[PDB]
Design an enzyme around this catalytic site. Structure first.
Site, short mmCIF file in Angstrom:
data_model
loop_
_atom_site.label_atom_id
_atom_site.label_comp_id
_atom_site.label_asym_id
_atom_site.label_seq_id
_atom_site.Cartn_x
_atom_site.Cartn_y
_atom_site.Cartn_z
N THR A 23 44.92 48.65 43.82
CA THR A 23 43.55 49.00 44.19
C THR A 23 43.48 49.60 45.60
O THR A 23 42.78 50.59 45.79
CB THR A 23 42.67 47.75 44.05
N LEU A 59 39.00 52.25 37.84
CA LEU A 59 40.10 51.92 38.74
C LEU A 59 40.27 50.40 38.92
O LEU A 59 41.37 49.88 38.76
CB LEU A 59 39.85 52.68 40.06
N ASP A 60 39.17 49.68 39.16
CA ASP A 60 39.18 48.22 39.34
C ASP A 60 39.06 47.41 38.04
O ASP A 60 39.18 46.19 38.09
CB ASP A 60 38.07 47.81 40.32
N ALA A 61 38.84 48.04 36.88
CA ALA A 61 38.67 47.33 35.61
C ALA A 61 39.76 46.27 35.35
O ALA A 61 39.44 45.10 35.14
CB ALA A 61 38.63 48.34 34.47
#
Lengths: 83, 50
Positions: A23, A59-61
């Site tokens: 991340t 992106l953060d899923a």
């Protein structure tokens, strides 16, 4: 039981640390392009900022799934039960 | 496609005359328009290079 506990402290560290690593590098690549686009087209910033948050959700899923499981293994423990 | 650069030429006198005579007042007629436009600027207060 002492091994079953001690290896979950390392599991949590990998699960949060690899998520933090991905991340942090991922937003450096995405954010660096947001600043490049914003300098090229200042009149498009209201639209580009909203599109960046669409990508930020993908992106953060998986990183947030990793953090959720890491807190689950910290305050509860489906392994210590030997189940 | 490159709006970030705005060359000065794109944001806010050369005079041509003959080398021989026999013209039908061609030089005078332009020189009479050069003087008319120069007047508007002298009235407005600007200086003029040529």
């Amino acid at each position: 039981m002492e091994t079953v506990v001690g290896l979950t402290a390392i599991a949590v560290a990998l699960l949060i640390g690899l998520g933090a690593l991905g991340t942090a590098i991922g937003f450096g690549l995405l954010g660096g392009k947001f600043l490049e686009g914003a300098a090229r087209q200042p009149e498009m910033v209201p639209m580009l900022q909203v599109k960046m948050f669409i990508v930020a959700g993908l992106l953060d899923a998986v990183t947030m799934i990793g953090v959720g499981i890491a807190l689950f293994f910290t305050f509860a423990n489906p392994f210590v039960g030997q189940i | 496609a490159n709006p970030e650069y705005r060359h000065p030429f794109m944001v806010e006198y050369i005079v041509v005359s003959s080398d021989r005579g026999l013209c039908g007042g061609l030089n005078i007629n332009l020189f009479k328009s050069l003087v008319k436009d120069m007047s508007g600027y002298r009235e407005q207060g600007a200086e003029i290079d040529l």
